[PDB]
Design an enzyme around this catalytic site. Structure first.
Site, PDB file in Angstrom:
ATOM      1  CG  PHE A  25      -2.156   0.824   1.061  1.00 27.11           C
ATOM      2  CD1 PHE A  25      -2.109   2.177   1.354  1.00 27.11           C
ATOM      3  CD2 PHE A  25      -3.366   0.267   0.674  1.00 27.11           C
ATOM      4  CE1 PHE A  25      -3.231   2.970   1.236  1.00 27.11           C
ATOM      5  CE2 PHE A  25      -4.501   1.056   0.551  1.00 27.11           C
ATOM      6  CZ  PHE A  25      -4.430   2.411   0.836  1.00 27.11           C
ATOM      7  CG  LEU A  28      -1.377   1.134  -4.638  1.00 24.27           C
ATOM      8  CD1 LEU A  28      -1.203   0.309  -5.872  1.00 24.27           C
ATOM      9  CD2 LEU A  28      -2.501   0.535  -3.821  1.00 24.27           C
ATOM     10  CG  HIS A  29       1.326   7.026  -0.768  1.00 24.39           C
ATOM     11  ND1 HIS A  29       0.769   8.252  -1.060  1.00 24.39           N
ATOM     12  CD2 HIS A  29       2.480   7.285  -0.107  1.00 24.39           C
ATOM     13  CE1 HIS A  29       1.545   9.210  -0.586  1.00 24.39           C
ATOM     14  NE2 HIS A  29       2.592   8.650  -0.006  1.00 24.39           N
ATOM     15  CD  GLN A  30       7.284   5.973  -1.632  1.00 25.12           C
ATOM     16  OE1 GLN A  30       7.105   4.800  -1.304  1.00 25.12           O
ATOM     17  NE2 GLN A  30       8.412   6.628  -1.366  1.00 25.12           N
ATOM     18  CB  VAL A  33       2.738  10.364  -5.004  1.00 23.83           C
ATOM     19  CG1 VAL A  33       3.755  11.502  -5.116  1.00 23.83           C
ATOM     20  CG2 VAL A  33       1.809  10.613  -3.839  1.00 23.83           C
TER      21      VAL A  33
END
EC number: 3.1.-.-
Lengths: 187, 293
Positions: A25, A28-30, A33
């Site tokens: 996760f 995934l967030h990076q 972004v």
């Protein structure tokens, strides 16, 4: 969103699956972004709301070009020994829809003390009598434990899957994949 | 003839405490004055260790001693049981060498599995291994640890030379001292993962570090013969071979494939098991520990 990708956490002795889903996760967030956009959603089709578990599956929903792009990026470098891939295919028919919402709490009273004393220039005791220690909210939601890069802070993020609807409406998504009006197909 | 009441084996493959340091990439061959990763405290008060904001490479360094004499126990009551066990390991060695076991140990040395949480999410890791004969270096190996996977045991000529050196050490034909340096590319200001004490972090004097038994647990992660599954991969060699994370035990004694029942069948009753199980029990004798009543 038409296309979904299922990545399964490979069962690992060296780390529990909660830590692998945490780092998955986070990367995934990076990656979200690094790509931007608000039409990219997430879902967890191995839900178990009895013991509040997130399971072993991660289903990312977007178009075809976005998913085939996210396969060939270095957000999967260093992780591909620890998880298995699927195939970006169409959502079958018919399926219900639901959301992925981040539900925090004011379970820390001290942040509310700092807020009420920084905006109002109160004392410690006026802030203590204004908001008591019973403000801490308890949650039975599954959570992911991520850290921060620049000013490093590790926090748990609670995920709530909303009620199953029959039709989905338009709406954006954050860099976390969480629903801001747009719903993911649940299957 | 029965098993002895006390029986103890010293560990072979003694690792050191792996020290942590930091620096920038392509200074990897100049990594002798690299500053160490300092553990600091922050707000509950938790101690965390981060790389400095101008460094993207975590360098861990330890040493490994391969000694040999893996069949002889350090303590034993019965003499006939000791002679039976010694001749049993002698027939194992005369059948095949330590080549499979040293090959798997050289594999676990090749990949940077001793970086437990410092390997996951790293874009590039590299392992330098020096066989140090006298006070100076005698041989160098260089490995891309991302190339060697954590699931399969491959073949490579430099890896086979390293495995031949380790098997020569385990056979007692020579004394082996290796120095293992590993470089990991994580990024600027990222966190590292040293071992945690009984939250506080393990530290040699003003430097973050990993426990030596952690590196030792990573180094013996060679067990690929447990009868439950094999698609998960290798585990560390243990009697009732289990893992603390999953909370489940392979080599359950209801099945006839734990270490103790295999050893009792091989030594007492001369029921020699399959050769992969022979590799398993000899790996447990290399691991050492307290066996007996």
């Amino acid at each position: 969103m038409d296309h979904y990708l299922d990545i399964r956490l490979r069962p690992d002795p060296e780390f529990p699956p909660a830590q692998l889903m945490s780092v998955l996760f986070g990367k995934l967030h990076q990656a979200l972004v690094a790509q931007g956009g608000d039409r990219i959603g997430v879902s967890f089709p191995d839900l178990d709301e009895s013991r509040s578990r997130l399971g072993e599956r991660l289903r990312i929903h977007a178009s075809a070009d976005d998913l085939r792009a996210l396969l060939a990026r270095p957000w999967l470098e260093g992780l591909r020994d620890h998880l298995q891939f699927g195939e970006p295919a169409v959502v079958p028919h018919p399926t219900p829809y639901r959301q992925v919402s981040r539900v925090q709490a004011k379970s820390n009273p001290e942040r509310l003390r700092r807020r009420l004393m920084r905006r109002h220039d109160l004392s410690e005791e006026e802030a203590r009598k204004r908001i008591p220690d019973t403000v801490a909210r308890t949650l039975d939601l599954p959570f992911v434990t991520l850290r921060s890069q620049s000013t490093g802070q590790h926090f748990r993020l609670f995920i709530r899957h909303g009620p199953l609807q029959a039709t989905a409406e338009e709406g954006g998504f954050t860099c976390y994949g969480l629903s801001k009006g747009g719903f993911v197909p649940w299957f | 003839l029965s098993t002895a009441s006390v029986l103890a084996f010293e560990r072979k493959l003694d690792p050191s405490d792996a020290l942590m340091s930091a620096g920038a990439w392509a200074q990897r061959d100049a990594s002798q004055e690299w500053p160490a990763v300092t553990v600091r405290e922050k707000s509950q008060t938790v101690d965390v260790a981060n790389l400095p904001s101008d460094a993207d490479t975590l360098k861990v360094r330890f040493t490994l001693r391969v000694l040999g004499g893996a069949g002889t126990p350090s303590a034993c009551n019965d003499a006939a049981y000791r002679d039976k066990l010694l001749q049993t390991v002698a027939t194992y060695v005369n059948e095949q060498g330590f080549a499979e076991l040293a090959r798997r140990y050289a594999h676990n040395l090749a990949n940077a599995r001793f970086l437990w949480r410092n390997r996951v999410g790293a874009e590039a890791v590299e392992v330098r291994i020096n066989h140090i004969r006298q006070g100076e270096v005698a041989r160098t190996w260089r490995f891309d640890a991302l190339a060697i996977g954590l699931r399969d045991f491959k073949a490579d000529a430099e890896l086979d030379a390293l495995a031949e050196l380790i098997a020569s050490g385990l056979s007692g034909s020579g004394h082996v001292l290796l120095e293992v340096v590993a470089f990991a590319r994580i990024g600027d200001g990222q966190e590292v993962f040293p071992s945690q004490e009984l939250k506080t972090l393990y530290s040699v004097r003003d430097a973050a570090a990993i426990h030596s038994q952690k590196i030792g647990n990573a180094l013996r992660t060679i067990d690929t013969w447990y009868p439950d599954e094999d698609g998960l991969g290798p585990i560390a060699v243990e009697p009732y071979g289990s893992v603390t994370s999953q909370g489940k035990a392979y080599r359950q004694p209801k099945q006839k494939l734990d270490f103790y029942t295999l050893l009792d069948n091989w030594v007492l009753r001369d029921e020699a098991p399959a050769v992969e199980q022979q590799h398993y029990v000899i790996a447990n004798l290399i691991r050492g520990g307290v066996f007996g009543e």
